[PDB]
Amino acid sequence: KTVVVTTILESPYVMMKKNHEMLEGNERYEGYCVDLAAEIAKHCGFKYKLTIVGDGKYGARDADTKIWNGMVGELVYGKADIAIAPLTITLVREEVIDFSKPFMSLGISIMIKKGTPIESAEDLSKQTEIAYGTLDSGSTKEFFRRSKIAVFDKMWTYMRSAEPSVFVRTTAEGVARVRKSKGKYAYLLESTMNEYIEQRKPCDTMKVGGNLDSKGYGIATPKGSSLGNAVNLAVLKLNEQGLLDKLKNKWWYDKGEC
Amino acid sequence: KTVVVTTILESPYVMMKKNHEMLEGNERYEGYCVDLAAEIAKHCGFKYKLTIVGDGKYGARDADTKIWNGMVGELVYGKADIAIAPLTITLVREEVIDFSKPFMSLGISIMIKKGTPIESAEDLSKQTEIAYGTLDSGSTKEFFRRSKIAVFDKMWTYMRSAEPSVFVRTTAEGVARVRKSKGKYAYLLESTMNEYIEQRKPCDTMKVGGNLDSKGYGIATPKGSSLGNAVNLAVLKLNEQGLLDKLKNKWWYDKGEC
Ligand SMILES: NC(=O)COc1c(F)cc(SCCNS(=O)(=O)c2ccccc2)cc1F
Ligand SMILES: N[C@@H](CCC(=O)O)C(=O)O
Ligand SMILES: N[C@@H](CCC(=O)O)C(=O)O
Ligand SMILES: [Zn+2]
Ligand SMILES: [Zn+2]
Ligand SMILES: [Zn+2]
Ligand SMILES: [Zn+2]
């Protein structure tokens, strides 16, 4: 059976090839997770189809209904067999889906427009002139809502009540807002994405301060999928062989234009 | 039932307290893994006894007999219920034991005596005046014994054939060898241990170069153990509370004396 892979359009993980209208199926896409999907499928011995998550979301549970959206939702409700995307391993997600060992490390980080007078999360929390926000329906927002760490809870208190809204629906929207706002919007997003964007034209953003936490992305499968075990062994093999490092280099740094 | 925890004397993960005499059982020990064990035990709801691996090794499989030694062997042969130690997640181990998601990241690194004229692994490989080696029965030696990277394979060819032997039985022996060889021995070990030692008196070693790979330590249980699931959930939770970040600062940065 063709394994249905859910993923998300997020650079440089999955992107539309420039001539994708003349290509078919998996060939329409390129990027880190496209290359990785090919390798996981080869080492696990399955055929597969890449499908972009319909609602364009990573995955969170609605607080009132308790329905999961995004890629998590496609797995939970049986629409996809596997997710190969920059999907963060979290405890609440682990209650409903399974994750491989992580294939890439990351932490929450701060993106500013160059010259913004902020060097840290503590800096951000202590002022109001520069607004700051995070992506909707993702692990970064949930991180702040739940955190018991003084500085991060102070940030949550501000963000949840800030008007106009400081949350964005896609990473690209957040990045554009940073670039537009003349230094008055900072964006909280994962270090991997922050680092990619810093090396992309117009080279007008940068990552400041240390990461706020330390986690990783995992390949996710529905609970009790037969695929879980083989996928995990494939991730370990590819790490040890050096593939993951090679792919990071290909899509981040060899890709660099600043 | 009291859970038998296997671990290994390795700073700053598990150390006999200087002062101890009036202490018994688990109380004799201190360290990152000692603190982590107490947290895992509290979140999983079990009592436990810390035991130091009998053969003082992490664990490797004998090529001729296929018997596993070290902490891995203690799990495989049913001599302990769980290992809580800086035990590297590897493909060959995952075939015989289960690991939690990683609780700490590390990479292979180079330790020199300060002033040694080496800045990289490439430097080591291209010369012969300065000897170099690694720990026996651990993941670092296997890394080299398997690597296809030109520089690392060149290092392997040298190390496996060097006389006298460049391999050591314990990390402490490796560190002593660096300290007392006047810059003529360099030691390959994990970044975590290297960075700890660099901030300890006599402050005469340092980490040079970047890491050679990127991996993680996991909590290990015997295949199919009934502890596995609860332990993984606990590592997830401790990470998201930040407790793991807190213990890292306690045992690395608060321990600095240089
Ligand atoms: N390519 C790689 O080597 C990346 O793999 C790793 C790794 F080896 C270690 C870590 S430590 C950070 C926490 N480990 S986790 O991401 O599996 C996690 C996430 C949330 C709760 C508990 C544990 C990270 C990597 F990505
Ligand atoms: N990687 C995140 C999405 C990005 C973010 O939340 O910053 C997740 O899995 O939800
Ligand atoms: N962490 C290693 C031990 C130290 C080393 O090999 O450098 C292991 O689990 O085997
Ligand atoms: Zn391959
Ligand atoms: Zn004593
Ligand atoms: Zn606790
Ligand atoms: Zn033998």
Read off the CATH number of the domain in which A94 is found: 3.40.190.10
Instruction: Residue B235: give the domain boundaries.
Output: 1-106+216-255
Torsion of the alpha carbons at A38, A42, A46 and A50, rounded to the nearest 10: 0
User: CA–CA separation, B85 vs B8, rounded Å?
Assistant: 7
Instruction: Count CB neighbours of B251 within 10 A.
Output: 22
If asked whether residues B82 and B111 sit together in one domain, one would say no
Select the residue of A218, A240, A242 nearest B90 (Cβ to Cβ).
A240
Question: What is the Cα–Cα distance from B127 to B257, expressed in whole angstroms?
Answer: 33
**Residue with the two structure tokens 């998201």:** B240
On whether both B45 and B101 belong to a single domain, the answer is yes
- Whether residues B95 and B117 share a domain: the answer is no
**A250 and A161 belong to one structural domain:** no
Question: What is the CB neighbour count within 10 angstroms for residue A114?
Answer: 12
Q: Do B90 and B25 fall into the same domain?
A: yes
Q: Are residues B84 and B151 in the same domain?
A: no
Strand B48-52 with B15-16, pairing? unpaired
Residue in the structure block whose two tokens are 């890629």: A71
Q: A150-161 and A139-146 are packed helices; what angle lies between their axes, rounded to 10 degrees?
A: 110
Helix or strand or coil: residue A106?
A: strand
Question: DSSP assignment of A44-57, as one string?
Answer: HT--EEEEE-TT--
Looking at the structure, do residues A100 and A221 belong to the same domain, yes or no?
A: yes
- Total domains present in chain A: 2
Say if B213 is an interface residue toward chain A (CB within 8 Å).
Answer: yes
The total of other beta-carbon atoms located within 10 Å of residue A149's CB is: 18
Considering only CB atoms, B94 lies closest to which of A213, A236, A241, namely A236
Kindly state whether residues B186 and B156 are assigned to the same domain.
yes
A195 lines ligand 2 (CB under 6 A): no
Cα distance between residue B218 and residue B101, in whole Å: 6
* Contact yes or no for A240 and B99 at CB 8 A: no
Residue B59 backbone zone (phi > 0: left; psi -120 to 50: alpha; other: beta): left
Coil vs helix vs strand at A11: coil
- Experiment used for this model: X-ray
- CA separation for the pair B197, B186 (Å, rounded): 14
Tokens in use for A186?
A: 């900072």
Residue of A239, A243, A247 to mutate for B, most B C-beta atoms under 10 A: A239
Q: Phi then psi for A23, rounded to 5 degrees?
A: -110, 165
Same domain? A149 vs A97: no
The answer to whether B78 touches B222, Cβ cutoff 8 Å, is: yes
- With an 8 Å Cβ cutoff, is A214 touching chain B? yes
Q: Are A14 and A142 in a shared domain?
A: no
Identity of the residue numbered B141: K
* CB atoms A90 and B240 under 8 Å: yes
Q: Same domain for B91 and B52?
A: yes
Distance from CA of B236 to the nearest CA of A (A): 6
Specify the ligand 1 atom closest to the Cα of B104.
11
Q: Measured from the CB, is residue B239 less than 6 Å from ligand 1?
A: yes
Please check whether residues A88 and A128 belong to one and the same domain: no
Q: Does A6 appear as a known binding residue?
A: no
